[PDB]
CSV table of C-alpha atoms in Angstrom, one decimal:
chain,number,residue,atom,x,y,z
A,196,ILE,CA,155.6,83.3,61.2
A,197,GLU,CA,154.7,84.7,57.8
A,198,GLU,CA,158.2,84.4,56.5
A,199,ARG,CA,158.4,80.9,58.0
A,200,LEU,CA,155.5,79.9,56.2
A,201,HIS,CA,156.8,81.0,52.7
A,202,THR,CA,160.2,78.8,53.4
A,203,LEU,CA,157.7,76.5,54.0
A,204,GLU,CA,156.0,76.3,50.9
A,205,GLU,CA,159.9,76.3,49.3
A,206,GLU,CA,160.6,73.2,51.1
A,207,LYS,CA,157.3,72.0,50.2
A,208,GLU,CA,158.1,72.0,46.3
A,209,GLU,CA,161.1,70.7,46.8
A,210,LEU,CA,159.6,67.8,48.9
A,211,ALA,CA,157.6,67.1,45.9
A,212,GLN,CA,160.6,66.6,43.7
A,213,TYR,CA,162.4,64.5,46.1
A,214,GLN,CA,159.4,62.3,46.7
A,215,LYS,CA,159.1,61.8,42.7
A,216,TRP,CA,162.6,60.9,42.4
A,217,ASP,CA,162.7,58.5,45.3
A,218,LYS,CA,160.0,56.9,43.9
A,219,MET,CA,161.8,56.6,40.7
A,220,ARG,CA,165.1,55.1,42.8
A,221,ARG,CA,162.7,52.4,44.5
A,222,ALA,CA,160.9,51.4,41.4
A,223,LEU,CA,164.0,51.0,39.5
A,224,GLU,CA,166.0,49.4,42.1
A,225,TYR,CA,163.0,46.6,42.6
A,226,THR,CA,163.1,46.1,38.6
A,227,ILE,CA,166.6,45.3,38.5
A,228,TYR,CA,166.4,43.2,41.4
A,229,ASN,CA,163.7,41.3,39.6
A,230,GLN,CA,166.3,41.1,36.8
A,231,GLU,CA,168.5,39.6,39.4
A,232,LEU,CA,165.7,37.1,40.3
A,233,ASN,CA,165.2,36.3,36.7
A,234,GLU,CA,169.2,35.5,36.6
A,235,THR,CA,168.5,33.3,39.6
A,236,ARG,CA,165.7,31.4,38.2
A,237,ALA,CA,167.7,30.9,34.9
A,238,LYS,CA,171.1,29.9,36.2
A,239,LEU,CA,169.5,27.4,38.7
A,240,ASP,CA,167.6,25.7,35.9
A,241,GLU,CA,170.8,25.7,34.0
A,242,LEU,CA,172.4,23.5,36.3
B,975,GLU,CA,169.0,62.8,42.2
B,976,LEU,CA,169.2,61.1,45.5
B,977,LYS,CA,172.6,63.0,46.3
B,978,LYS,CA,171.1,66.2,45.0
B,979,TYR,CA,168.2,65.9,47.4
B,980,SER,CA,169.3,64.6,50.5
B,981,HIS,CA,168.1,67.2,53.0
B,982,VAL,CA,164.6,67.6,52.4
B,983,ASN,CA,162.4,68.5,55.7
B,984,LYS,CA,159.4,66.0,55.6
B,985,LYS,CA,156.1,66.5,57.4
B,986,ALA,CA,155.9,70.0,55.6
B,987,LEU,CA,152.4,69.5,54.1
B,988,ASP,CA,150.6,69.0,57.4
B,989,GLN,CA,152.3,72.1,58.9
B,990,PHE,CA,151.0,74.2,56.2
B,991,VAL,CA,147.5,73.2,56.3
B,992,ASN,CA,147.1,73.2,60.3
B,993,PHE,CA,149.3,76.2,60.6
B,994,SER,CA,147.6,78.5,57.9
B,995,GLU,CA,144.3,77.8,59.3
B,996,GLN,CA,145.0,78.6,63.1
B,997,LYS,CA,147.0,81.7,61.7
B,998,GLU,CA,143.6,82.6,59.9
B,999,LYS,CA,142.1,81.9,63.4
B,1000,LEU,CA,144.4,84.3,65.2
B,1001,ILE,CA,144.4,86.8,62.6
B,1002,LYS,CA,140.4,86.9,63.2
B,1003,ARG,CA,141.3,87.2,67.0
B,1004,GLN,CA,143.6,90.1,66.2
B,1005,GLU,CA,141.0,92.1,64.5
B,1006,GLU,CA,138.4,91.4,67.0
B,1007,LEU,CA,140.8,92.5,69.3
B,1008,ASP,CA,141.5,95.9,67.5
B,1009,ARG,CA,138.1,97.1,66.9
B,1010,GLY,CA,137.3,96.1,70.8
B,1011,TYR,CA,140.1,98.9,71.4
B,1012,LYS,CA,138.6,101.5,69.1
B,1013,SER,CA,135.2,100.8,70.9
B,1014,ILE,CA,136.7,101.3,74.4
B,1015,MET,CA,138.0,104.5,73.8
B,1016,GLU,CA,134.8,106.0,72.3
B,1017,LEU,CA,133.0,104.6,75.3
B,1018,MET,CA,135.4,106.0,77.7
B,1019,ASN,CA,135.2,109.7,75.9
B,1020,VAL,CA,131.7,109.4,76.0
B,1021,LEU,CA,131.7,108.7,79.7
B,1022,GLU,CA,134.3,111.7,79.9
B,1023,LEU,CA,131.5,114.0,78.5
C,10,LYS,CA,124.4,86.5,90.7
C,11,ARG,CA,121.7,87.0,88.0
C,12,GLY,CA,121.7,88.7,85.1
C,13,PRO,CA,123.3,88.9,81.4
C,14,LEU,CA,126.2,91.0,82.5
C,15,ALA,CA,127.0,89.1,85.8
C,16,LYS,CA,130.4,88.3,84.5
C,17,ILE,CA,131.5,92.0,83.9
C,18,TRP,CA,130.1,92.2,87.7
C,19,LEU,CA,132.5,89.7,88.7
C,20,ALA,CA,135.5,90.7,86.7
C,21,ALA,CA,135.0,94.1,88.3
C,22,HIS,CA,134.6,93.1,91.7
C,23,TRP,CA,136.3,89.9,92.6
C,24,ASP,CA,138.0,89.1,89.0
C,25,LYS,CA,139.9,85.9,90.7
C,26,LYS,CA,137.4,82.8,89.9
C,27,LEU,CA,137.7,84.3,85.9
C,28,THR,CA,139.1,81.4,84.4
C,29,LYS,CA,140.3,81.3,80.8
C,30,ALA,CA,136.9,79.2,79.6
C,31,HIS,CA,135.0,82.1,81.1
C,32,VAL,CA,137.2,84.9,79.4
C,33,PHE,CA,137.5,82.8,76.2
C,34,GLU,CA,134.1,82.8,74.3
C,35,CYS,CA,131.4,83.6,77.2
C,36,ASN,CA,131.1,87.4,76.0
C,37,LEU,CA,130.9,88.9,72.6
C,38,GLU,CA,132.7,92.5,73.4
C,39,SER,CA,131.0,94.6,70.3
C,40,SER,CA,127.7,94.0,71.9
C,41,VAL,CA,128.1,94.3,75.5
C,42,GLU,CA,130.2,97.6,74.9
C,43,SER,CA,127.0,98.8,72.9
C,44,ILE,CA,124.9,97.7,75.8
C,45,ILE,CA,126.4,100.0,78.3
C,46,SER,CA,125.7,103.3,76.4
C,47,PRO,CA,121.7,103.6,76.4
C,48,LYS,CA,120.8,101.2,79.4
C,49,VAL,CA,118.0,103.3,82.0
C,50,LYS,CA,119.1,104.1,85.3
C,51,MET,CA,122.9,103.4,85.0
C,52,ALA,CA,125.2,104.7,87.9
C,53,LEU,CA,128.2,106.6,87.0
C,54,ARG,CA,130.1,104.5,90.0
C,55,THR,CA,128.9,101.2,88.0
C,56,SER,CA,130.0,102.5,84.8
C,57,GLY,CA,133.4,103.0,85.8
C,58,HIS,CA,133.3,99.6,87.2
C,59,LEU,CA,132.2,97.8,84.3
C,60,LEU,CA,134.7,100.1,82.2
C,61,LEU,CA,137.4,98.4,84.3
C,62,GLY,CA,135.8,94.8,84.0
C,63,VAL,CA,135.6,95.0,80.1
C,64,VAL,CA,138.9,96.5,79.8
C,65,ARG,CA,140.5,93.9,81.9
C,66,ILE,CA,138.6,91.1,79.8
C,67,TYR,CA,140.4,92.7,76.8
C,68,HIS,CA,143.7,92.6,78.3
C,69,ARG,CA,143.2,88.7,79.4
C,70,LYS,CA,142.5,87.8,75.8
C,71,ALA,CA,145.4,89.8,74.5
C,72,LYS,CA,147.7,87.8,76.8
C,73,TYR,CA,146.3,84.6,75.8
C,74,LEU,CA,146.7,85.6,71.9
C,75,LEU,CA,150.6,86.5,72.7
C,76,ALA,CA,150.7,83.4,74.8
C,77,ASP,CA,149.4,81.2,71.9
C,78,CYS,CA,151.3,83.0,69.0
C,79,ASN,CA,154.7,82.4,71.0
C,80,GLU,CA,153.7,78.7,71.5
C,81,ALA,CA,152.8,78.4,67.7
C,82,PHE,CA,156.2,79.9,66.9
C,83,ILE,CA,157.9,77.5,69.1
C,84,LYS,CA,156.1,75.0,67.2
C,85,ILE,CA,156.9,75.5,63.5
C,86,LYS,CA,160.6,75.4,64.6
C,87,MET,CA,160.8,71.9,64.2
C,88,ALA,CA,162.3,69.8,61.0
C,89,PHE,CA,163.3,66.6,60.3
C,90,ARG,CA,166.3,66.3,57.9
C,91,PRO,CA,167.5,62.4,58.0
C,92,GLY,CA,170.6,63.1,56.2
């Protein structure tokens, strides 16, 4: 059980790092699709 | 970054907290159990006497 | 029946009605074990009986701890890797 808790601690740090980067991906994705929405507004007004 | 971090085991944090507390509880049980065994042996020798 | 050591009586004579709730936290071992030694007018017969009782109690607690540990180890082996 002690060994397994140690491995858990390792996986905990891994989880923290993945969580941060996953947040990065979600924010970036939303922002670039916001830019897509801006293109939507722009080109619809252009017509 | 996604491709590198695919296989992470979620739920680890709650696992850690709960299982650490429960492990402490059982360890305390174990120490009490040891002291009890010691006491039994001493009392048994006294009875023999 | 009546007394602050009746549980050890029961564990030494009948022992079957003794539930995991009884064994669990009713008795603090290190005090009753001390209690056995200086009590006035203790029969040797009763002393051996009480010995069997308290040792069986300790055995039950040990078993319960082992069971709980095994259960815990089965618990921790889960994981969730969504791929």
